[PDB]
Amino acid sequence: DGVGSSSGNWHCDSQWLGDRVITTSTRTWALPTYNNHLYKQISNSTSGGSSNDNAYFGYSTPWGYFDFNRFHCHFSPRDWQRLINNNWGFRPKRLNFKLFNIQVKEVTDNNGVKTIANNLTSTVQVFTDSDYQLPYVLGSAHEGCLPPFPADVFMIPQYGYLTLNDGSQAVGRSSFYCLEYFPSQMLRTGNNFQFSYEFENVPFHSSYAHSQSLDRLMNPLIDQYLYYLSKTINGSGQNQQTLKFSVAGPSNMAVQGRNYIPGPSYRQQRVSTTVTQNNNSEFAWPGASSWALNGRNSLMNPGPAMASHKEGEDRFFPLSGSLIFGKQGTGRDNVDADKVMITNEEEIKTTNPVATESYGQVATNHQSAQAQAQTGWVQNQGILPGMVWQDRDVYLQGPIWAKIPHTDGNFHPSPLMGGFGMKHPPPQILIKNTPVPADPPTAFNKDKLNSFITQYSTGQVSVEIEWELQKENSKRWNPEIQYTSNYYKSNNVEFAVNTEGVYSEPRPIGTRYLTRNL
Amino acid sequence: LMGGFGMKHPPPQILIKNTPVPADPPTAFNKDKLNSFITQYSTGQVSVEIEWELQKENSKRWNPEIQYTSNYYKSNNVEFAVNTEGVYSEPRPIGTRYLTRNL
Amino acid sequence: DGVGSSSGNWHCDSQWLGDRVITTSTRTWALPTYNNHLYKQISNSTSGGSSNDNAYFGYSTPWGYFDFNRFHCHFSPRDWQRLINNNWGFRPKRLNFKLFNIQVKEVTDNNGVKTIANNLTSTVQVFTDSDYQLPYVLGSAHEGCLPPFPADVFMIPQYGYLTLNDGSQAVGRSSFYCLEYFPSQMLRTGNNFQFSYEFENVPFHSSYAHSQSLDRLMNPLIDQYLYYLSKTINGSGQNQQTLKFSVAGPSNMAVQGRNYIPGPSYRQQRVSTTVTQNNNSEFAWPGASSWALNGRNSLMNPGPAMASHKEGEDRFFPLSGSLIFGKQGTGRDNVDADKVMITNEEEIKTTNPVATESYGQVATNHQSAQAQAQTGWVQNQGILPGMVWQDRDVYLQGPIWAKIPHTDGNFHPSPLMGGFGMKHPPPQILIKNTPVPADPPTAFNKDKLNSFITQYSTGQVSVEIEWELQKENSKRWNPEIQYTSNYYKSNNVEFAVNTEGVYSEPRPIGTRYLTRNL
Amino acid sequence: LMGGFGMKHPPPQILIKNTPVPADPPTAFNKDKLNSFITQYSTGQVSVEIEWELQKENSKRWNPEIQYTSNYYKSNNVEFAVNTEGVYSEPRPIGTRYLTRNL
Amino acid sequence: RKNRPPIAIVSPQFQEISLPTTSTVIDGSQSTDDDKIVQYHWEELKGPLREEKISEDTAILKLSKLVPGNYTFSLTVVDSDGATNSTTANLTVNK
Amino acid sequence: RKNRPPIAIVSPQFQEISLPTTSTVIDGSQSTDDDKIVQYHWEELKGPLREEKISEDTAILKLSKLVPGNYTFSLTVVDSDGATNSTTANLTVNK
């Protein structure tokens, strides 16, 4: 409770129990002073000018925030291997967030050399938005999460939010939120902040693959008692028209009746990682699958969970239908294809349509003696009764949850980027260095004080999520596919630091390894 | 699709009919159904009382919201009120979506 | 509770008790169908066009109302004599309003001869506005009260109300009140309506005159210990200036010091009942005392309670500062001076200034060796500390109460027309014949039904107010002035019917007869 | 006369002062009051919480009242909010007299 | 909307007064309109040459320092929608 | 208020295509503005005589039934406050 007594210990364990795992995780943060304690409106006009699609209007608060909404903030690579090689599913039950060992530093650059001193009497104020009265910028797949590796320090992101706009201009119903209008908690160097949160009843993540296709769900030895129209002409003549029905069975498995159909589709453009197999034109934006909202288009990216490619063509990926991660030390502007990690979603090709292929055929006319049986293509298909699909995979680097937008309705609110869609996700934890004025004038001045002491804050942060698990019980005989670290000599151990001490995640690890038949 | 609340069991249909009153049956029996009725109508009052639950607003929005106001500008007739002939007119369709709630 | 059993008896007594009087009063009413069951907006545009002062905008409802807000609705002339000759004050305590013996009649003029039948199954709906959510048109000194004489039938007035306007047009904040939006009470021919009401704690009416003037409040034998500046020059020369103070006493009662001063004034124009003593010009409106509100002028009529005339000049009355009543059978447009009853307010000349005279003098410069002592006239004088005044008299034909407008403040809220000013006066009792459609078409028609059965309603109404009394206890020796019916032969007994059976009140009877010294 | 609530005993004046800290008294006694102080200032937080009673509206007025709304029309800055420089501006004086109450 | 033009009503059509009392009044505030009158305009026609003319805009006309002669004033009222109505008022002052 | 004029950005400055694939695309939806662009206008300059001209208003330009020749298109964007910015786009189609 004092300056010279630590306000919390470093817990970073991960204890596996009978039916749950409690992944604790601690990090060191550094919170700068954002906006110089100011609230500023931000727009594409401020940012120099953007197109109609990228037009926006919002505010940038002087508040930081904590975002542990990536799977590696909690799971080590070995923990992820234990989770995905052994369980058919998992879901978070509760979290316990602690913010301790706070220490606010004051820096002075009066002589040209900065001198970071210690400000014991200065506070940092942190509050959690547990009523969801603020814009929820988590679940947008942003940066600034707790780093994957426990050893490195991270800088807390700035909290800004967007609102309604007509171009760069604010329509009358665009809200402005002051985050000082919330009851915060003012913490000195001897105080600490902690809160607990109980996750929703979200379904288990389908942490498995399917060992049975949706169209091959049947006995390959017995034939159906149903008939299908086999022939429509009994010959090659002119006026030879018949209706010959044959029983649909193992000989012709394609035509036989089925109770369920693959999930919904929304076609993407098939771009190949072998650049000589693509078109010579710039089809990046023009050839993309977008959805329009109030006039301005926006990329699907990634859209409904569809299989990335057919079997045998690993090169093809949907133009925007897959999550792309960056390798360690990868720039943020036009990097080569070998510097990113494009996640394949082929484990769900058993139930979901291929992202780069049309959902199927459909008859588009009434054939008669004069008009041939004309049939069209179904590029996008919404939900139909009897459709079964499977959601997008969660990855070690991918998001964990997202907030279901408060609307009068939704369908299957699992996030299109993967994860658990919650009406009430973990609350936004917002932290800000309390302003300290430098020297008020000796004579009263009505204007707000603009000269503050330049200072920052640092400390530790501990989040502990308890995940429920769905153990495997399958009568499969042969071994399953499991995630292994390949035993072959290499310069660096993967998922470990190299000679410079920079920790790199070398691939995106999914969850769908164990197989479960339909 | 027209708006409202879709119910499997909505408020029941209340069906009312003036019971027929024959005028004058013949003094000799006639098997045919009576076709001469007394011409009559009915009138009265009807009272319906619905109890609506409400979902109060609790938003941390700072600036004022858009709200439905009657515009303060002189006009021949008060809107949503009778004119000189006593005929009551609703001058516009009023929706419900005025308060703002973020997604 | 049935059609053939009366729903209430005729109580019209007036029983005098030890310290209160309970004046019961019953009448027969006739309620027509107003506006043909319609709500209509009314304006000076509707009424053909009015000036800027008389511009208005409002609505005329199909509702009648009961208005027992005149003193003769309860007090017979003999009861009034008992009250005013024997008491120094009175105030209402509680009322008990009953509405019974309702009978709705249906009239048919199909053949050119009307045939008023009896509609037993038709109702009349009456409600009392006991939360004061409606415009309060009572206390406006309107007509349609219960008649002074119990024997005659009266027609219930229409209820209309005015709201805000800019000319004839409705500004945005001008309210429209539907009186069907109130829970009413639907009464058939066998039902009855009654309610009770407890009056406020209003002060007693000063039902007395003052037997002592405000400036003659002193011992006429002893002289004051205070001095007054008697002389300012000791002679008639040029440079003869002094300050000679003499003791103010019985010899010069005008100049001696006084603790209290007459009440506020707002001068009126002195018009004489001897028309040869007036000006030859039309000074009725131009010479009047008005007050402006939002641009449009409105007559004072009657304004602050001021004495009507000095002693000895009974002819002069203030142009608008007195209540004028009409004799029996008097028109409503430019009647002669001998057909109206102008009420004198001279009983309060002891404390109040004369309505037709300025409040007094006031010094309007600094006199010096060069400037004479210049003094001006005080035509209107607001309230000052130490002012004592007396309110306007209540009359047998005058109003009883009024509603104090709901404002952030007021001063001495007694009605300027006389009576008791109440925040919560007796509620407006609103009655309406429920519409009965004639014949709806055999085929559905979305339009509102416009063909109704022409019908009216009639019945009895009983109001009983309990008045507290303030008995006289004075050590005055000689007899007081008391209201007497003059014993001299006349064609008709006053306050009684003549050969045609029309009851006439021959004069306005005040209350200030007994004397009470200051 | 400027508006508000006139009280005989209004909220008391809260008076705060940095206590003087002399810099260096002379090593030899000097009767004069110390004039050399350490130049110093103070800072901190201040919290005031007022509980206001309210008088709810109960009017039988039919048509809508005039109410304070933030106008829905695109503008460079949200009113009653900070602009690009972070300076918060109140763009108009907001009164209280919006609901109507008859006399 | 389809407003009727105003009506100008001067209370004293023939105002009579002698030389001792020059200060007289002509009342035009009784002029009616379907909505409201936005301007009352007083202008003289037969007024003999005097110290000053009259072009007052008060609804009620106040006169002063009259000289003997015959006066004729015309009151112009203005509807909210621009319609006007001018009526004349006469005043004869004696020697 | 003191709005900066828009900027028209055509993604393919030199569009190249052969005769078999005439249907090409020129992207002008990347054109930026301080507020928003209310109109994208496509007009051709060096277009050889063909079945039809081009004056489309779509942000992204879709072309069809091209004939061999050299094409030059100029994209005109319009700020909300009327400021305009025209940039040119080239397309050469082979035999």
User: Distance of CA D72 to CAs A172, A448, B42, B99, Å?
Assistant: 3, 29, 51, 12
Give the residues across from F88 on adjacent strands: F74
**CA–CA dist C24, C8 (Å, integer):** 14
- Helices (H), ranges, chain F: none
Cβ of C49 and E4 within 8 Å?
yes
**CA–CA dist C363, A347 (Å, integer):** 105
What DSSP letter does each residue of A100-150 carry, written as one string?
Answer: EEEEEEEEE-TTSS-EEEE-SS--EEEEEETT--S---TTS--S-PPPSST
Rg (CA), chain D: 26
**3-state helix vs strand vs coil in chain C, percent to 5:** 5, 30, 65
Closest residue of chain D to C406, computed from CA coordinates: D103
Q: For residue A408, give how far its alpha carbon lies from the nearest alpha carbon of chain D (Å).
A: 23
Residue with tokens 């049935």: C2
Resolution rounded to one decimal, in angstroms: 3.2
Q: For residue A194, give how far its alpha carbon lies from the nearest alpha carbon of chain B (Å).
A: 23
Q: Which helix (H) or strand (E) holds C57?
A: strand C57-66
Sign of the alpha-carbon dihedral angle for C55, C57, C60, C61: negative
Which long-range contacts (C-beta less than 8 Å, at least 24 apart) are formed by B37-45?
B41/C439, B41/C440, B42/B16, B42/B18, B43/C436, B43/C437, B45/C186, B45/C434
Q: Are C468 and C291 in contact (CB under 8 A)?
A: no
Q: Are A461 and A98 in contact (CB under 8 A)?
A: yes
Residue with tokens 């035993």: A487
Give the residues across from C148 on adjacent strands: none
**Cis bond upstream, residue A302 (ω within 30):** yes
User: Distance of CA C156 to CAs B7, C146, C273, Å?
Assistant: 49, 9, 35
Taking the Cβ of residue A414 and every Cβ of chain F, the question of whether any pair is shorter than 8 Å is answered with no
Q: State both tokens at A295.
A: 């006039």
Best residue of A173, A180, A181 to probe chain B, by most B CBs closer than 10 Å: A173
Give me the amino acid identity at D31.
Answer: K
Helix (H, G, I), strand (E, B) or coil at A244: strand
**CA–CA dist F64, E2 (Å, integer):** 59
Cβ of A297 and F16 within 8 Å?
no
Residue with tokens 């989040």: A463
Helix (H, G, I), strand (E, B) or coil at C84: helix
A344 labeled binding residue: yes
Q: Which helix (H) or strand (E) holds A198?
A: strand A193-198
User: Distance of CA A176 to CAs A39, A67, A511, C112, Å?
Assistant: 10, 22, 40, 73
Taking the Cβ of residue D37 and every Cβ of chain A, the question of whether any pair is shorter than 8 Å is answered with no
- Rounded (5°) CA angle C125-C129-C133: 130
b/e code C5-24 from CB counts within 10 Å (16+ = b): eebbeeeeebeeeeebbbbb
Q: State both tokens at E46.
A: 């037969």
Q: Are A132 and A161 in contact (CB under 8 A)?
A: no
Q: Are C490 and C506 in contact (CB under 8 A)?
A: no
Q: State both tokens at C317.
A: 């009355």
Cβ of D63 and B79 within 8 Å?
yes
Kindly state the DSSP code that residue C35 receives in the 8-state scheme: T
Length of chain C in residues, anyone? 518
Best residue of C43, C46, C52 to probe chain E, by most E CBs closer than 10 Å: C52
Residues 6+ apart with CB under 8 A from C512: C84, C206, C207, C208, C209, C347, C348, C393
Give the residues across from A420 on adjacent strands: A401
Q: Are A50 and F37 in contact (CB under 8 A)?
A: no
Q: Return the C-alpha torsion angle A135, A139, A144, A147, nearest 10.
A: 150
- Do chains E and C meet with 3 or more Cβ pairs nearer than 8 Å? yes
Q: Are E25 and E11 in contact (CB under 8 A)?
A: no
Helix (H, G, I), strand (E, B) or coil at D23: coil
Number of H helices, E strands in chain A: 1, 29
Number of H helices, E strands in chain D: 0, 0
Q: For residue B82, give how far its alpha carbon lies from the nearest alpha carbon of chain D (Å).
A: 11
What DSSP letter does each residue of A322-357 carry, written as one string?
Answer: S-EEE-TT--SSS--GGGEEEPP-GGGTTTSPBTTS
Collect all residues of chain D within an 8 Å Cβ-Cβ radius of residue B79. Answer: 63
Query: Of B94, B36, B33, which Cα lies nearest the Cα of B66?
Result: B94
Q: Are B46 and D63 in contact (CB under 8 A)?
A: no
**CA–CA dist E58, C195 (Å, integer):** 52
Kindly state the DSSP code that residue C235 receives in the 8-state scheme: S
Contacting chains of A (3 CB pairs or more, <8 Å) are B, D, F
Strand pairing report for A261-262 and A375-378: unpaired
Class of residue E2 by CB neighbours under 10 A (exposed 0-12, middle 13-18, buried 19+):
exposed
Residues 6+ apart with CB under 8 A from C198: C93, C94
Q: State both tokens at D49.
A: 């919480």
Taking the Cβ of residue A16 and every Cβ of chain B, the question of whether any pair is shorter than 8 Å is answered with no
Q: Are E79 and E55 in contact (CB under 8 A)?
A: no
Q: State both tokens at E40.
A: 């009352």
Query: Of A166, A8, C288, C189, which Cα lies nearest the Cα of E25?
Result: C288
**How many other CB atoms are found less than 10 A from the CB of residue A462?**
22
- Helices (H), ranges, C383-459: none
Residue with tokens 């109508």: B41
Collect all residues of chain D within an 8 Å Cβ-Cβ radius of residue B66. Answer: 69-70, 72
Q: State both tokens at F11.
A: 């993604």
Q: For residue A333, give how far its alpha carbon lies from the nearest alpha carbon of chain D (Å).
A: 27
Helix (H, G, I), strand (E, B) or coil at C348: helix
Sign of the alpha-carbon dihedral angle for D24, D28, D31, D32: negative
**CA–CA dist B92, B79 (Å, integer):** 9
Binding positions of C for beta-D-galactose: 252, 285
**Cis bond upstream, residue C302 (ω within 30):** yes
- Rounded (5°) CA angle B44-B49-B53: 165
Q: State both tokens at C362.
A: 């006031």
Q: Which helix (H) or strand (E) holds A80?
A: helix A77-86
Q: For residue A183, give how far its alpha carbon lies from the nearest alpha carbon of chain D (Å).
A: 11
**How many other CB atoms are found less than 10 A from the CB of residue A387?**
14
Q: State both tokens at C343.
A: 């009420």
Length of chain E in residues, anyone? 95
Residues 6+ apart with CB under 8 A from D11: none
Residues 6+ apart with CB under 8 A from C339: C326, C327, C330, C331
Class of residue A413 by CB neighbours under 10 A (exposed 0-12, middle 13-18, buried 19+):
middle
**CA–CA dist C303, C392 (Å, integer):** 10
Binding positions of C: 252, 285, 344, 347
- For C46, the closest of B41, B84, B87 (CB atoms) is B84
Class of residue A424 by CB neighbours under 10 A (exposed 0-12, middle 13-18, buried 19+):
middle
Helix (H, G, I), strand (E, B) or coil at C61: strand
Sign of the alpha-carbon dihedral angle for A15, A16, A20, A26: positive
Q: Are C436 and C455 in contact (CB under 8 A)?
A: yes
**CA–CA dist B98, B95 (Å, integer):** 8
Residues 6+ apart with CB under 8 A from A442: none
Q: Which helix (H) or strand (E) holds C82?
A: helix C77-86
Kindly state the DSSP code that residue A82 receives in the 8-state scheme: H
Taking the Cβ of residue D103 and every Cβ of chain C, the question of whether any pair is shorter than 8 Å is answered with yes
- Do chains F and E meet with 3 or more Cβ pairs nearer than 8 Å? no
**CA–CA dist D95, D35 (Å, integer):** 50
Kindly state the DSSP code that residue A479 receives in the 8-state scheme: P
Residue with tokens 């489309």: F56
Collect all residues of chain F within an 8 Å Cβ-Cβ radius of residue A45. Answer: 34-35
**CA–CA dist A136, A425 (Å, integer):** 9
Q: Are C486 and C369 in contact (CB under 8 A)?
A: no
Cβ of F36 and A166 within 8 Å?
yes
Q: State both tokens at C448.
A: 């509102």
Contacting chains of C (3 CB pairs or more, <8 Å) are B, D, E
Taking the Cβ of residue B60 and every Cβ of chain A, the question of whether any pair is shorter than 8 Å is answered with yes
Query: Of E41, E44, E29, E47, which Cα lies nearest the Cα of E85?
Result: E41
Cβ of A176 and B63 within 8 Å?
yes
Q: Are A421 and A402 in contact (CB under 8 A)?
A: yes
Q: For residue D17, give how far its alpha carbon lies from the nearest alpha carbon of chain B (Å).
A: 34
Strand pairing report for C401-403 and C420-422: parallel
Taking the Cβ of residue B37 and every Cβ of chain C, the question of whether any pair is shorter than 8 Å is answered with no
Domain ranges of chain E: 12-95
Q: State both tokens at F16.
A: 């190249």
Alpha carbons within 13 A on the beta-carbon side of A228: 14
Q: Are A346 and A352 in contact (CB under 8 A)?
A: no
Kindly state the DSSP code that residue A169 receives in the 8-state scheme: B
Cβ of D74 and A186 within 8 Å?
no
**CA–CA dist A433, A34 (Å, integer):** 9
Cβ of B81 and D63 within 8 Å?
yes
Closest residue of chain C to E7, computed from CA coordinates: C49
Q: For residue B100, give how far its alpha carbon lies from the nearest alpha carbon of chain A (Å).
A: 7
**How many other CB atoms are found less than 10 A from the CB of residue B64?**
17
Sign of the alpha-carbon dihedral angle for E76, E78, E84, E85: negative
Helix (H, G, I), strand (E, B) or coil at C204: coil
Q: Return the C-alpha torsion angle C163, C167, C170, C174, nearest 10.
A: -30
b/e code F66-85 from CB counts within 10 Å (16+ = b): beeeebebebbbbbbeeeeb
Collect all residues of chain C within an 8 Å Cβ-Cβ radius of residue D61. Answer: 175-177
Alpha carbons within 13 A on the beta-carbon side of C466: 13
| Determination technique used | cryo-EM
Residues 6+ apart with CB under 8 A from C187: C99, C102, C123, C124, C125, C126, C193
User: Distance of CA A296 to CAs A54, C384, F29, Å?
Assistant: 8, 71, 10
- Do chains F and C meet with 3 or more Cβ pairs nearer than 8 Å? no
Helix (H, G, I), strand (E, B) or coil at C275: helix
Closest residue of chain D to C164, computed from CA coordinates: D102
Q: Are F53 and F80 in contact (CB under 8 A)?
A: no
Q: For residue A57, give how far its alpha carbon lies from the nearest alpha carbon of chain B (Å).
A: 15
Total number of domains in chain C: 1
Sign of the alpha-carbon dihedral angle for C97, C101, C106, C109: negative
